[PDB]
Design an enzyme around this catalytic site. Structure first.
Site, PDB file in Angstrom:
ATOM      1  N   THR A 289       7.106   2.349  -8.651  1.00 36.89           N
ATOM      2  CA  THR A 289       5.617   2.336  -8.613  1.00 36.89           C
ATOM      3  C   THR A 289       5.062   1.215  -9.476  1.00 36.89           C
ATOM      4  OG1 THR A 289       5.406   4.050 -10.356  1.00 36.89           O
ATOM      5  CG2 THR A 289       5.519   4.765  -8.055  1.00 36.89           C
TER       6      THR A 289
ATOM      7  N   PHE B 210      -3.269   7.769  -7.594  1.00 36.73           N
ATOM      8  CA  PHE B 210      -2.424   8.685  -8.405  1.00 36.73           C
ATOM      9  C   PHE B 210      -2.471  10.093  -7.824  1.00 36.73           C
ATOM     10  CE2 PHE B 210      -3.318   5.174 -11.321  1.00 36.73           C
ATOM     11  CZ  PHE B 210      -2.029   4.845 -11.671  1.00 36.73           C
TER      12      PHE B 210
ATOM     13  N   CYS C  92      -0.509  12.406 -10.380  1.00 35.09           N
ATOM     14  CA  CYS C  92       0.532  11.718 -11.157  1.00 35.09           C
ATOM     15  C   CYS C  92       0.456  12.112 -12.628  1.00 35.09           C
ATOM     16  CB  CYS C  92       0.373  10.218 -11.046  1.00 35.09           C
ATOM     17  SG  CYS C  92       1.752   9.332 -11.815  1.00 35.09           S
TER      18      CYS C  92
HETATM   19  C1  HEM Z   1       1.403   2.683 -10.729  1.00 38.21           C
HETATM   20  C2  HEM Z   1       2.297   3.622 -11.035  1.00 38.21           C
HETATM   21  C3  HEM Z   1       2.304   4.927 -10.350  1.00 38.21           C
HETATM   22  C4  HEM Z   1       1.678   5.349  -9.213  1.00 38.21           C
HETATM   23  C5  HEM Z   1       0.837   4.514  -8.280  1.00 38.21           C
HETATM   24  C6  HEM Z   1       1.980   6.731  -9.055  1.00 38.21           C
HETATM   25  C7  HEM Z   1       1.497   7.504  -7.986  1.00 38.21           C
HETATM   26  C8  HEM Z   1       1.709   8.869  -7.869  1.00 38.21           C
HETATM   27  C9  HEM Z   1       1.166   9.684  -6.850  1.00 38.21           C
HETATM   28  C10 HEM Z   1       0.282   9.187  -5.731  1.00 38.21           C
HETATM   29  C11 HEM Z   1       1.579  10.959  -7.074  1.00 38.21           C
HETATM   30  C12 HEM Z   1       1.226  12.166  -6.232  1.00 38.21           C
HETATM   31  C13 HEM Z   1       2.315  12.390  -5.183  1.00 38.21           C
HETATM   32  C14 HEM Z   1       2.029  13.504  -4.210  1.00 38.21           C
HETATM   33  O1  HEM Z   1       0.943  14.138  -4.202  1.00 38.21           O
HETATM   34  O2  HEM Z   1       2.943  13.780  -3.395  1.00 38.21           O
HETATM   35  C15 HEM Z   1       2.380  10.922  -8.244  1.00 38.21           C
HETATM   36  C16 HEM Z   1       3.002  12.036  -8.773  1.00 38.21           C
HETATM   37  C17 HEM Z   1       3.861  11.911  -9.868  1.00 38.21           C
HETATM   38  N1  HEM Z   1       4.136  10.805 -10.585  1.00 38.21           N
HETATM   39 FE1  HEM Z   1       3.466   9.069 -10.365  1.00 38.21          FE
HETATM   40  N2  HEM Z   1       2.754   7.123 -10.071  1.00 38.21           N
HETATM   41  C18 HEM Z   1       2.992   6.110 -10.903  1.00 38.21           C
HETATM   42  C19 HEM Z   1       3.748   6.038 -12.068  1.00 38.21           C
HETATM   43  C20 HEM Z   1       4.487   7.103 -12.569  1.00 38.21           C
HETATM   44  C21 HEM Z   1       5.285   7.123 -13.723  1.00 38.21           C
HETATM   45  C22 HEM Z   1       5.540   5.956 -14.646  1.00 38.21           C
HETATM   46  C23 HEM Z   1       5.828   8.391 -13.827  1.00 38.21           C
HETATM   47  C24 HEM Z   1       6.718   8.962 -14.852  1.00 38.21           C
HETATM   48  C25 HEM Z   1       7.090   8.284 -15.931  1.00 38.21           C
HETATM   49  C26 HEM Z   1       5.347   9.152 -12.730  1.00 38.21           C
HETATM   50  C27 HEM Z   1       5.640  10.475 -12.512  1.00 38.21           C
HETATM   51  C28 HEM Z   1       5.029  11.211 -11.496  1.00 38.21           C
HETATM   52  C29 HEM Z   1       5.319  12.646 -11.375  1.00 38.21           C
HETATM   53  C30 HEM Z   1       6.274  13.454 -12.218  1.00 38.21           C
HETATM   54  C31 HEM Z   1       4.586  13.069 -10.328  1.00 38.21           C
HETATM   55  C32 HEM Z   1       4.534  14.495  -9.827  1.00 38.21           C
HETATM   56  C33 HEM Z   1       3.473  15.241 -10.644  1.00 38.21           C
HETATM   57  C34 HEM Z   1       3.303  16.694 -10.275  1.00 38.21           C
HETATM   58  O3  HEM Z   1       3.143  17.025  -9.082  1.00 38.21           O
HETATM   59  O4  HEM Z   1       3.327  17.576 -11.164  1.00 38.21           O
HETATM   60  N3  HEM Z   1       4.518   8.346 -12.000  1.00 38.21           N
HETATM   61  N4  HEM Z   1       2.469   9.628  -8.729  1.00 38.21           N
HETATM   62  C1  LIG Z   2       7.025   9.996  -8.529  1.00 38.91           C
HETATM   63  C2  LIG Z   2       5.656   9.458  -8.068  1.00 38.91           C
HETATM   64  N1  LIG Z   2       5.153   8.554  -9.103  1.00 38.91           N
HETATM   65  C3  LIG Z   2       5.712   8.738  -6.779  1.00 38.91           C
HETATM   66  C4  LIG Z   2       4.782   9.013  -5.784  1.00 38.91           C
HETATM   67  C5  LIG Z   2       4.822   8.365  -4.540  1.00 38.91           C
HETATM   68  C6  LIG Z   2       5.822   7.413  -4.317  1.00 38.91           C
HETATM   69  C7  LIG Z   2       6.775   7.153  -5.318  1.00 38.91           C
HETATM   70  C8  LIG Z   2       6.719   7.794  -6.543  1.00 38.91           C
END
Ligand code: HEM
Ligand SMILES: C[C@@H](N)c1ccccc1
Ligand SMILES: O=C(CCCCC1CCCCC1)N[C@@H](Cc1ccccc1)C(=O)O
EC number: 1.14.14.1
Length: 455
Positions: free
Chosen positions: A268, A393, A400
């Site tokens: 990401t 996010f 996220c």
């Molecule tokens: C620009 C960077 C990032 C973007 C654009 C992004 C985007 C997203 C999105 C769209 C989701 C929702 C997914 C869904 O509804 O299926 C998500 C969930 C998540 N992201 Fe990210 N993410 C980023 C960076 C990170 C980083 C650095 C971490 C951890 C170090 C992370 C951990 C997670 C986790 C654990 C979830 C699941 C949260 C939950 O449902 O409890 N993400 N992310």
């Molecule tokens: C783990 C989460 N940050 C994520 C969401 C959607 C695509 C890739 C990763």
């Protein structure tokens, strides 16, 4: 009045499935959205998906009383190695709320003060790499951004150095994780997954899952065996208790969380940084304004946490890059109950929705006529952006957890990049977007001329 949903062209018994027989399915779905509008039905054998593109409908989809996070088929395939980590767990699984309650404090704006020094460690390695290029040489942007963001979450996550800047060929773990993500996404296109054609694919997948489990389970065991208390996510997960159940995470779930964080860091933030630099070199006036902020704010050899918080325009650049090319480009919802979307589209309990984030972010009713233009100034005031217009996010309690982490890292790194170098789009790069779990600008290269400012 109850409307019939548009549907793209069909292929007899295969219905719409062959439309996503491409290496760029998200960009294929964006072109379908351009043709059919704010909502379309997508049928495959034994499956219905509805793709939403308008803020009008997505604002309803984001109502947590009516819709919950769905595991897309993509996330169901990722769950074969990400298990019931936060990303691939259902909201109703006990381990979702438990891990969520335990990890929220680790991911707070406040926790970022603690991770800052380790992010700076990797960011300084990136700057040093570029300072050390010779005159004729160029930067492979997504390659270097992926080295960076993988290493950052390795170090902050579990005090593990992937040492990506010491390597051409990725750490073995990463070669297995990338191949597992590739298998997960390729499986979406197999009209008959139980063919023996796909028997070698199945066997490689199992080996890759083992490589991932073995390094991660060994990392957890080594940490438990050492008794060392580093201020990283692994320490928080080993010591944390969910206030609700009073229970800690078990070692298997901690493994899934670590695999999940590594997927996130690799896929990401690296994409965001690559798209942000792409837009800056394509918009020299915006690059200059961001460079001016970096020079004004980053007055010390090493950026401080407080200095990163003062990079307002750099944060706007990152949000504008997330608007045009949300590197995580979709999330899936299901209807908790029978309901009517937008006064027009009846849904049954369990009906699946896909939010097409790149299309949401191009809604001209929200952003106006200059919607394809890169204008970070759109993000001056969060209160002037309509509700649920901007979802890079995701949404609500299933948003996220890493958002603060990602934006702190991306702001720090892009700040240092703009402080230390002038950039040249020396090839007049033509955007070519590679799709994994995420979108990245493939083959994006630049030249950096050092401003010769010491670290
Ligand atoms: C620009 C960077 C990032 C973007 C654009 C992004 C985007 C997203 C999105 C769209 C989701 C929702 C997914 C869904 O509804 O299926 C998500 C969930 C998540 N992201 Fe990210 N993410 C980023 C960076 C990170 C980083 C650095 C971490 C951890 C170090 C992370 C951990 C997670 C986790 C654990 C979830 C699941 C949260 C939950 O449902 O409890 N993400 N992310
Ligand atoms: C783990 C989460 N940050 C994520 C969401 C959607 C695509 C890739 C990763
Ligand atoms: O919309 C897509 C293809 C783009 C996913 C992009 C998505 C993958 C997760 C990380 C964020 C980006 N997939 C749906 C519908 C589907 C199901 C089976 C076969 C073909 C399509 C699904 O995975 O449920």
């Amino acid at each position: 009045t109850i409307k019939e949903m548009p549907q793209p062209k069909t292929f007899g018994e295969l219905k719409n499935l062959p439309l996503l027989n491409t290496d760029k399915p998200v960009q294929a779905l964006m072109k379908i959205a351009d043709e059919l509008g704010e909502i379309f039905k997508f049928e495959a054998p034994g499956r219905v998906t509805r793709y939403l593109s308008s803020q009008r409908l997505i604002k309803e989809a984001c109502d947590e009383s009516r819709f919950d996070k769905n595991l897309s088929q993509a996330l169901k395939f990722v769950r074969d190695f990400a298990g019931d980590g936060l990303f691939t767990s259902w909201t109703h699984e006990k381990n979702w709320k438990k891990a969520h309650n335990i990890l929220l404090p680790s991911f707070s704006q406040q926790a970022m003060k603690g991770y800052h020094a380790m992010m700076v460690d990797i960011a300084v390695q990136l700057v040093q790499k570029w300072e050390r290029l010779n005159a004729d040489e160029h930067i492979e942007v997504p390659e270097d951004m992926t080295r960076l963001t993988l290493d950052t979450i390795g170090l902050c996550g579990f005090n593990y150095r992937f040492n990506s800047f010491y390597r051409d060929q990725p750490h073995p773990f990463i070669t297995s994780m990338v191949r597992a993500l590739d298998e997960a996404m390729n499986k979406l296109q197999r009209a008959n997954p139980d063919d023996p054609a796909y028997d070698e694919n199945k066997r490689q997948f199992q080996e890759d899952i083992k490589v991932m489990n073995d390094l991660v389970d060994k990392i957890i065991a080594d940490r438990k065996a050492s008794g060392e208390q580093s201020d990283d996510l692994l320490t928080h997960m080993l010591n944390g208790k969910d206030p609700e159940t009073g229970e800690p995470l078990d070692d298997e779930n901690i493994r899934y969380q670590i695999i999940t964080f590594l997927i996130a860091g690799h896929e990401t933030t690296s994409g965001l940084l690559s798209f942000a630099l792409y837009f800056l070199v394509k918009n020299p006036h915006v690059l200059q304004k961001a460079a001016e902020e970096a020079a004004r704010v980053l007055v010390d050899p090493v950026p401080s946490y407080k200095q990163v918080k003062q990079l307002k325009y750099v944060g706007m650049v990152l949000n504008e890059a997330l608007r045009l090319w949300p590197t995580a480009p979709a999330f899936s919802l299901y209807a908790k109950e029978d309901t009517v979307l937008g006064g027009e589209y009846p849904l049954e309990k369990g009906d699946e929705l896909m939010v097409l984030i790149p299309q949401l972010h191009r809604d001209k009713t929200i952003w106006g006529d200059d919607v394809e233009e890169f204008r970070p100034e759109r993000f001056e005031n969060p209160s002037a952006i309509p509700q649920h217009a901007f979802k890079p996010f995701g949404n609500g309690q299933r948003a996220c957890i890493g958002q603060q982490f990602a934006l702190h890292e991306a702001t720090l790194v892009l700040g240092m990049m703009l402080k230390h170098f002038d950039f040249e789009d020396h090839t007049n790069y033509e955007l070519d977007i590679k799709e994994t779990l995420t979108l990245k600008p493939e083959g994006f290269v630049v030249k950096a001329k050092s401003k010769k400012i010491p670290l």
